[PDB]
Design a protein around this nucleic acid. Structure first.
Ligand SMILES: [Cl-]
Ligand SMILES: [Cl-]
Ligand SMILES: [Mg+2]
Ligand code: NA
Ligand code: NA
Ligand code: NA
Length: 325
DNA sequence: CGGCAGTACTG
DNA sequence: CAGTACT
DNA sequence: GCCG
């Protein structure tokens, strides 16, 4: 279980020559839609990174959880010949599929459809493809959404959101989560979690917050924002700080009731692989973990803090920086 | 043999 | 619903 | 792809 171990184990990858090759294959399977095969590769790559020494034999490889016969056969090939033959036999569509699936709002199904229809470049997409509203925004920001920002900029973005929220309710609590909270030097987007310790005033805040942030020109486009019925849980969109030298940045906001704060903080801090491992562990123990609660397979268990979730799952606590799986 | 996380929008 | 998205 |  990855969630039972510190992610600092990957700080020194004694198997980088193997993992750099498997990562190419994992991405090729992923963009072609074979998500489960790609997941198996992702987990094997993480196991190889965290392993304490270079892998040198077939029996050694199989002893690692996440590495089976077929993955072991690939390891010994790399060790004996320095090359992996399958990398020379990837489907020729893969580079274009990767290009297309990096449009926000397009996944494997859309990329494969565009490829089938004869498109091969973003010029083809721009001029000839049918784009959803979201995908047209993704394309307009194609380069910017592949950039990571310095964490100092993420601080500025969180503070912009926080100042706007607290301007109409000074008791609101705002926390930047994701890779920022895990201590990374750069961040792909800014994840802001908002709650209120009174357990009630979090309701009806999205409408005022978003209009405030629109009034000052901070939000430049919206991707996901269900503002019609008042039950909105998340906002996914695009922002840009004022002044020269600023790029458009992805911004994700969730508003949660205080009773769900610890589970929401755990979820939104990630990493994604950390969450999937913790949720899988919960299932083996007759429980279920979501952004809303830790439950039995059910009864909601009391989790006032992140530490309580770890404890109820029988896991030693990990600080956010040690969840970077 | 079948799961592989669990959830929130969009149209 | 399927697709894509969040961590 | 891996695992129970
Ligand atoms: Cl969730
Ligand atoms: Cl906490
Ligand atoms: Mg985000
Ligand atoms: Na290691
Ligand atoms: Na194994
Ligand atoms: Na995409």
């Amino acid at each position: 279980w990855v969630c039972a171990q510190p992610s600092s184990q990957k700080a020194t990858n004694h198997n980088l020559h193997i993992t750099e090759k498997l990562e190419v294959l994992a991405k090729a399977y992923s963009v072609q839609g074979d998500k489960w095969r790609a997941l198996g590769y992702a987990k094997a790559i993480n196991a190889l990174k965290s392993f304490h020494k270079p892998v040198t034999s077939y029996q050694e490889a199989c002893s690692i959880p996440g590495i089976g016969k077929r993955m072991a056969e690939k390891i010994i090939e790399i060790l004996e010949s320095g090359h992996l033959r399958k990398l020379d036999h990837i489907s020729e569509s893969v580079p274009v599929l990767e290009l297309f699936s990096n449009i926000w709002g397009a996944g494997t199904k859309t990329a494969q459809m565009w490829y089938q229809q004869g498109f091969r470049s973003l010029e083809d997409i721009r001029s000839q493809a049918s784009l959803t509203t979201q995908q047209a925004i993704g394309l307009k920001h194609y380069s910017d959404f592949l950039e990571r920002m310095p964490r100092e900029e993420a601080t500025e973005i969180e503070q912009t959101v926080q100042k706007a929220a607290q301007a109409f309710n000074s008791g609101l609590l705002c926390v930047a989560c994701g890779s920022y909270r895990r201590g990374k030097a750069t961040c792909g987007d800014v994840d802001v979690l908002i709650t209120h310790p009174d357990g009630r005033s979090h309701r009806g805040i999205f409408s005022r917050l978003l209009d405030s942030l629109r009034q000052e020109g901070f939000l430049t486009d919206d991707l996901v924002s269900q503002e019609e019925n008042g039950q909105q849980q998340k906002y996914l969109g695009v922002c840009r700080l004022p002044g020269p030298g600023r790029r458009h940045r992805r911004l994700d906001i969730i508003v949660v009731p205080y009773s769900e704060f610890a589970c929401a903080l755990l979820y939104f801090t990630g990493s994604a692989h950390f969450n999937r491992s913790m949720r899988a562990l919960a299932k083996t123990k007759g429980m279920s973990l979501s952004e809303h609660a830790l439950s039995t397979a059910g009864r909601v268990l009391p989790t006032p803090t992140e530490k309580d979730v770890f404890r109820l799952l029988g896991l030693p606590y990990r600080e956010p920086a040690e969840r970077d799986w």
